[PDB]
Amino acid sequence: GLINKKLPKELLLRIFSFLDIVTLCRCAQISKAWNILALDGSNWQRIDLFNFQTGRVVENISKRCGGFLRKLSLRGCIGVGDSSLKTFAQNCRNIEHLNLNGCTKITDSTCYSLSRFCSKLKHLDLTSCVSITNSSLKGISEGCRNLEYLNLSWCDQITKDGIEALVRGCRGLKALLLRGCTQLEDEALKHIQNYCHELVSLNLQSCSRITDEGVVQICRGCHRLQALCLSGCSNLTDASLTALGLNCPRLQILEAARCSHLTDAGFTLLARNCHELEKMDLEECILITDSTLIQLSIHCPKLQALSLSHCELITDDGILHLSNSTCGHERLRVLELDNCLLITDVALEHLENCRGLERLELYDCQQVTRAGIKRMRAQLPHVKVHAYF
Amino acid sequence: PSIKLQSSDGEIFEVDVEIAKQSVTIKTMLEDLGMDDEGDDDPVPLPNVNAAILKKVIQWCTHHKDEKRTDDIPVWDQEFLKVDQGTLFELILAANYLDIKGLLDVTCKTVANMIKGKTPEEIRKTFNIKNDFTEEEEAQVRKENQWC
Amino acid sequence: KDVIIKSDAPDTLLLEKHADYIASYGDDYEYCMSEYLRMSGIYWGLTVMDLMGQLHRMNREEILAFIKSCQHECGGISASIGHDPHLLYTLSAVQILTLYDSINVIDVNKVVEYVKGLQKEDGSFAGDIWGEIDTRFSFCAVATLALLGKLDAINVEKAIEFVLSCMNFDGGFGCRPGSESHAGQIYCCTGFLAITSQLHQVNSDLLGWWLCERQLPSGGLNGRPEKLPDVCYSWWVLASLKIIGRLHWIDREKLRNFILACQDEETGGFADRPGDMVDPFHTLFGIAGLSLLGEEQIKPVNPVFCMPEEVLQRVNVQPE
Amino acid sequence: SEEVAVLVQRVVKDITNAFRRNPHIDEIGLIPCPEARYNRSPIVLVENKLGVESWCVKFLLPYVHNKLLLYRTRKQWLNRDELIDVTCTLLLLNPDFTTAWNVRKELILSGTLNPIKDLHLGKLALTKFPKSPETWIHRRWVLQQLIQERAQRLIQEEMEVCGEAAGRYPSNYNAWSHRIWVLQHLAKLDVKILLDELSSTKHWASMHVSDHSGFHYRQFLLKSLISQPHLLEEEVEFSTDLIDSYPGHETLWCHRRHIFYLQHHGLEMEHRFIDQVLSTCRNVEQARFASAYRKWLVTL
Numbered sequence A: 001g002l003i004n005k006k007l008p009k010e011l012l013l014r015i016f017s018f019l020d021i022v023t024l025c026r027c028a029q030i031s032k033a034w035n036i037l038a039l040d041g042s043n044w045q046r047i048d049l050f051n052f053q054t055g056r057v058v059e060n061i062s063k064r065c066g067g068f069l070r071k072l073s074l075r076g077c078i079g080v081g082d083s084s085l086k087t088f089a090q091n092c093r094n095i096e097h098l099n100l101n102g103c104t105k106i107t108d109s110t111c112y113s114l115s116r117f118c119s120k121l122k123h124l125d126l127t128s129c130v131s132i133t134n135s136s137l138k139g140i141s142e143g144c145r146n147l148e149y150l151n152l153s154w155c156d157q158i159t160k161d162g163i164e165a166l167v168r169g170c171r172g173l174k175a176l177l178l179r180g181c182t183q184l185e186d187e188a189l190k191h192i193q194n195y196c197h198e199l200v201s202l203n204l205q206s207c208s209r210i211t212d213e214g215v216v217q218i219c220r221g222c223h224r225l226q227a228l229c230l231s232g233c234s235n236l237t238d239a240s241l242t243a244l245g246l247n248c249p250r251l252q253i254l255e256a257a258r259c260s261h262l263t264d265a266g267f268t269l270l271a272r273n274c275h276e277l278e279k280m281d282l283e284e285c286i287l288i289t290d291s292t293l294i295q296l297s298i299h300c301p302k303l304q305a306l307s308l309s310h311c312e313l314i315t316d317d318g319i320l321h322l323s324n325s326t327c328g329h330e331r332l333r334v335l336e337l338d339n340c341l342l343i344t345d346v347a348l349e350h351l352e353n354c355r356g357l358e359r360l361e362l363y364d365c366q367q368v369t370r371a372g373i374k375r376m377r378a379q380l381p382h383v384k385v386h387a388y389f
Numbered sequence B: 001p002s003i004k005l006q007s008s009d010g011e012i013f014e015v016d017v018e019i020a021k022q023s024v025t026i027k028t029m030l031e032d033l034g035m036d037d038e039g040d041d042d043p044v045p046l047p048n049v050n051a052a053i054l055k056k057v058i059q060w061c062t063h064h065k066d067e068k069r070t071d072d073i074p075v076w077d078q079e080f081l082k083v084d085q086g087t088l089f090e091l092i093l094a095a096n097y098l099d100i101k102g103l104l105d106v107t108c109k110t111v112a113n114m115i116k117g118k119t120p121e122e123i124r125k126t127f128n129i130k131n132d133f134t135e136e137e138e139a140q141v142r143k144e145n146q147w148c
Numbered sequence C: 001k002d003v004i005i006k007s008d009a010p011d012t013l014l015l016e017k018h019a020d021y022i023a024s025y026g027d028d029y030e031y032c033m034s035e036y037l038r039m040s041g042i043y044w045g046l047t048v049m050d051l052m053g054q055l056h057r058m059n060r061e062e063i064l065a066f067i068k069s070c071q072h073e074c075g076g077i078s079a080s081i082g083h084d085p086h087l088l089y090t091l092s093a094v095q096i097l098t099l100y101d102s103i104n105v106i107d108v109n110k111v112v113e114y115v116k117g118l119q120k121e122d123g124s125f126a127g128d129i130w131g132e133i134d135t136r137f138s139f140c141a142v143a144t145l146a147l148l149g150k151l152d153a154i155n156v157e158k159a160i161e162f163v164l165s166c167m168n169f170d171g172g173f174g175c176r177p178g179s180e181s182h183a184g185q186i187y188c189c190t191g192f193l194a195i196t197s198q199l200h201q202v203n204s205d206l207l208g209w210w211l212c213e214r215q216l217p218s219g220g221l222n223g224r225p226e227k228l229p230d231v232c233y234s235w236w237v238l239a240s241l242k243i244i245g246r247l248h249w250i251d252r253e254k255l256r257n258f259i260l261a262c263q264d265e266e267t268g269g270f271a272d273r274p275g276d277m278v279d280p281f282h283t284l285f286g287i288a289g290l291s292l293l294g295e296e297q298i299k300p301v302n303p304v305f306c307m308p309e310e311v312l313q314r315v316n317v318q319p320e
Numbered sequence D: 001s002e003e004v005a006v007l008v009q010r011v012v013k014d015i016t017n018a019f020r021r022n023p024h025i026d027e028i029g030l031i032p033c034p035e036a037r038y039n040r041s042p043i044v045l046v047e048n049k050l051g052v053e054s055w056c057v058k059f060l061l062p063y064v065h066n067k068l069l070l071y072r073t074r075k076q077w078l079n080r081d082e083l084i085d086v087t088c089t090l091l092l093l094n095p096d097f098t099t100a101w102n103v104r105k106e107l108i109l110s111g112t113l114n115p116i117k118d119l120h121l122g123k124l125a126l127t128k129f130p131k132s133p134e135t136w137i138h139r140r141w142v143l144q145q146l147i148q149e150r151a152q153r154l155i156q157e158e159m160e161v162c163g164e165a166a167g168r169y170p171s172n173y174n175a176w177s178h179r180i181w182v183l184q185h186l187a188k189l190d191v192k193i194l195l196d197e198l199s200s201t202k203h204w205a206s207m208h209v210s211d212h213s214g215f216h217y218r219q220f221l222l223k224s225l226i227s228q229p230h231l232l233e234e235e236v237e238f239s240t241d242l243i244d245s246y247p248g249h250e251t252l253w254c255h256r257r258h259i260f261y262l263q264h265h266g267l268e269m270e271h272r273f274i275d276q277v278l279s280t281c282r283n284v285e286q287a288r289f290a291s292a293y294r295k296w297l298v299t300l
């Protein structure tokens, strides 16, 4: 076969590295070369199951692989319950990455299996595992202390008491995703800053009980934060913005959609101390004026992606500043100005300096003409600009 | 902002420097090169890619400004990759030599897609691999690896 | 209240135009709007084509591949690829496979297990795992099982008892006990009671009396009091009357003129009513109704199963 | 082809944001508008009504339709928020898409969808698709989860939703079928509810004389009251009045049959009513139905 004559093993394994386990077992039946290739270790490293619900597969992989399963994705495999994952856990003790996103029949029972048998976990994804309680976080905190990444998204019955148990053991978490955990409040934020000083990424989206008391504490306790999401946390004020500036000089991503009270005061204090911001989502920060964008153009040389959706007060002026940024001349690619009612064709002429722009959104910017769009596409063919036209 | 690239056979290609540094290998050679005023404007030598493969690569890089998985290939690339097996393997090698991770992903996913959805003899027919297993061994392997 | 048949209404069967219409039937927006019933859409179209001696016009292999690709691991069959299984589209796919004598391209045993699993302790059937009760589903269940020769797989006596508790004092049936009587539902229950040999617990004079009052002065049939006449309800009422042997209680000639008046002379196809736009659904029921009234260009149709009688004889002459 | 994906996502976002701006939206409709002529959203909110400009629907439904199928078919993932919003948009456009409803059932079983949120969804889809069988079917599934006084508020909101859907669609069998069901499984034939329905709904029947579903609902009320006098007599008089004021409605004569059948558990009074009707009536339909009533009468 040409395939074997022209492609070396290193490349053949790269091909097989994209293959399901079923297809990988059929290649084992092709030849003696393709047998040694189909069963090489590097092909049993990660499994992503894309199967049928009616399970025993996860248990059969646990035996055929066992010792070398390192990453296991079960996202959306509603078939699996505690029984399969017990079997897999006792057979795959070296697992470092487990993704149980959407596995709805999962109980505290599997986090206990994981605690007993999977002390090398660095990455646990529990998104939408709704039957998980605080007790699961206690078991994980005992047996999974090297956890670097935990995702509790939409695990709505988790409370501050579970968070406390979890971080008291998983002191080394670098990424913690808590989106849609609406019972979380400021005490749970305070347990996090107490123990998770190496935290790089924190997602609090729709955790609308939290306040400045909790967020300010988090900045005090987590000086290595690079990514923070607080969209939907309406209670927040510029006080949380001042604490970020004061404590988090490595901030790269700040999502604060729907945080109405944020003002220019907060963002000026934030901008001056945070020279590594790359993404900022300020959708529905209505009080924000052109002044906020002014500071961003000065103090944020690497700004990459900016959303000003529904920031009504923004005018063509602030856009001129962005375009005459150091970041705007090459390092801005995504700008979202929709429902900024004051933006006109002139802003699109400003953004003709932004040779790096890939994506521009102008929905509901009614002052913007089909003409303006066409001449911007003409100067910057790189840009996809998006309006309702 | 344009460089010349010379293929293995000596044909020279004017390419914009931006679309061409999608190649980590090409970006490396530029960085290695000058910073030179006083040269002869010699092109960047690419001894391990012939002009036909280069053509296909440059066309792939111009179209792009921009998980164990193969249903992922964009439709432009699917069409682009409807080539004979020999050139597609050469495109894998080129993508590997030039370190164009986008191209090496789609091409590998494309060969991977040629294996999926077929029986072992349908595999060996697609790639003209000789079955060197006795019926004893073929029955065996369609043994372990059969679970499923 | 009624339609008026115009002096230029089609008065003769235009078989070639109907077969062309169904053979060229086939847009993306409205493909998606209809996909939740694709399986049955295909059943209407294949069945009318075989009733017209045109089944060979259709792509047997893409259909069988489609059906094979719609059976879920629970055994049930969905309306299209990636839709959730439902009893309705399991009936459809099994009807389609019966036309193509290809019942065994799917797992018959798991289809039987899927149907059996939808029965409830009171004899009723749900449409799918979520538990909507409808006599339409009692019909779909026994129709699917009868086609597979597997009526013993469910509790037939309980299923009968339930359907009988849906009988109204006006002789009709609705979806559940307490429901308004309804021609489509009466067809399902009547068909249920025929498949299971229980038509004698039906007061044929009562039911046929409710049924024959569905004929309007125009000749067409409605589905309920004071509804417009409709080809599809014309078929279900006509089918029911045949099953209970009260077909002499309507004026077959005026109804034939009504159904014929629903053809489009230019495009082929039947509309629900003269003047309206045609679709494959009413095309099937128009042609099926005419076969039942005696149109000899059309293969005889079975009133219970809405299939060519020849296809059910092939079923009934077997191990069975 | 890729600019449209962005646009459809945008329009999905616009629908969700409509409901944030006004959670008392109570009606949706298609705004005939084939051209996108200005940079405004095709989602138009005026007061409590949510209009959708038609030019975008050809893009929006195929994308959201296929997004849901790619999820169900395990080829593209959607998170909880997207599931909820993608399926919300689909059911607004095509509420007979059972697979879309079935995804919300799972979201509700898992606990991340408040059931009350699907009752509102169905209610709003029903303002545009009042007969939608699947919507009623889904709505019963939700209601039975909520029974496994809050009952009376549920019963009362069902009556209004069914009433709403009956006024929007002639002889809406499914709306009244659902209304029966609710009486059976939520009110369990409570005699004072049957009475309150009998009185509330006499007004509605007065105004919808050709609607047989409404009269059957009254037939159900009465039979079910039986299974636990002056009500039957008052329903025959009501039918006498209606037949006299609106000659020629088969629904009214069919109602009188059903109601007089129940009362008979005498016939001279009914003969003289038919005699007096047929002697002095100009309506030709009315004569058919009166002659038809007598042929029915004498087989008793």
Ligand SMILES: [Zn+2]
Pocket (backbone or CB within 6 Å): C230, C231, C232, C233, C272, C282
């Ligand atoms: Zn019809």
